[PDB]
Amino acid sequence: PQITLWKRPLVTIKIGGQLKEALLDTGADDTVLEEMNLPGRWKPKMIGGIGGFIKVRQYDQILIEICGHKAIGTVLVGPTPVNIIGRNLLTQIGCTLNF
Amino acid sequence: PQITLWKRPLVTIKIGGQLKEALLDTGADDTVLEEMNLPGRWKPKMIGGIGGFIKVRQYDQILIEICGHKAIGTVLVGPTPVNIIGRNLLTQIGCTLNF
Ligand SMILES: CC(C)CN(C[C@@H](O)[C@H](Cc1ccccc1)NC(=O)O[C@H]1CO[C@H]2OCC[C@H]21)S(=O)(=O)c1ccc2c(c1)CC[C@@H]2O
Residue B65: closest CA among B88, B23, B93: B93
Asked if residue B66 lies in contact with residue B93, where contact means CB atoms within 8 angstroms, the answer is yes
Question: What phi, psi does A84 have (nearest 5°)?
Answer: -125, 115
| β-bridge pairing B69-77 and B32-33 | parallel
Question: Is A25 considered catalytic here?
Answer: yes
3-state secondary structure of A4: coil
Determine, for residues A52 and B51 on separate chains, whether the beta-carbon distance falls below 8 Å: yes
From residue A5, how far is each of B16, B40, B41, B55, B94 by CA, in Å? Answer: 25, 28, 28, 25, 9
Per CATH, the architecture of B1-99 is what?
Beta Barrel (2.40)
What pairing do the DSSP bridges indicate for beta strands A18-24 and A84-85? parallel
For the residues of A19-74, what is the DSSP string, one character each?
EEEEEE-TT-SSEEE-S----S--EEEEEEETTEEEEEEEEEEEEEEETTEEEEEE
- Nearest Cβ partner for B96 among A49, A69, A98: A98
Reported resolution in A?
Answer: 2.0
| Chain A CB contacts of B90 below 8 Å | 5, 99
Residues paired with residue A2 on neighbouring β-strands, in sequence order = B98
The CA distance from A18 to the nearest CA of chain B, in Å, is: 22
**Centre of ligand 1 from the C-alpha of residue A80, in Å:** 10
CA distances from A69 to A77, A90, A98 (A): 21, 10, 19
Can you tell me the distance from the alpha carbon of A56 to that of A47, in angstroms, rounded to the nearest whole number?
7
- The sheet that has A96-98: what strands, in order across it? A2-3, B96-98, A96-98, B2-3
Give the residue among A15, A12, A11 at the shortest CA–CA distance from A74.
Answer: A15
Show me where the domains of chain A are located. Answer: 1-99
Between strands A52-66 and A10-15, the pairing is antiparallel
The secondary structure element, H or E, covering residue A15 is: strand A10-15
CA B22 to each of CA A9, A34, A71, A92, B86: distance values in angstroms, whole numbers, following the listed order: 20, 27, 28, 24, 10
CA dihedral angle for residue B49, residue B51, residue B56, residue B58, rounded to 10 degrees: 0
Task: Name the method of structure determination.
Answer: X-ray
User: Quick one: which of B55, B52, B49 has its CA closest to B84?
Assistant: B49
Sign of CA dihedral A87, A93, A97, B1: positive
CA distance A96 to A67: 15
List the residue whose alpha carbon is closest to atom 31 of ligand 1. A49
Q: Which residues of B touch A73 (CB under 8 A)?
A: none
Task: Determine contact, residues A82/A34, Cβ cutoff 8 Å.
Answer: yes
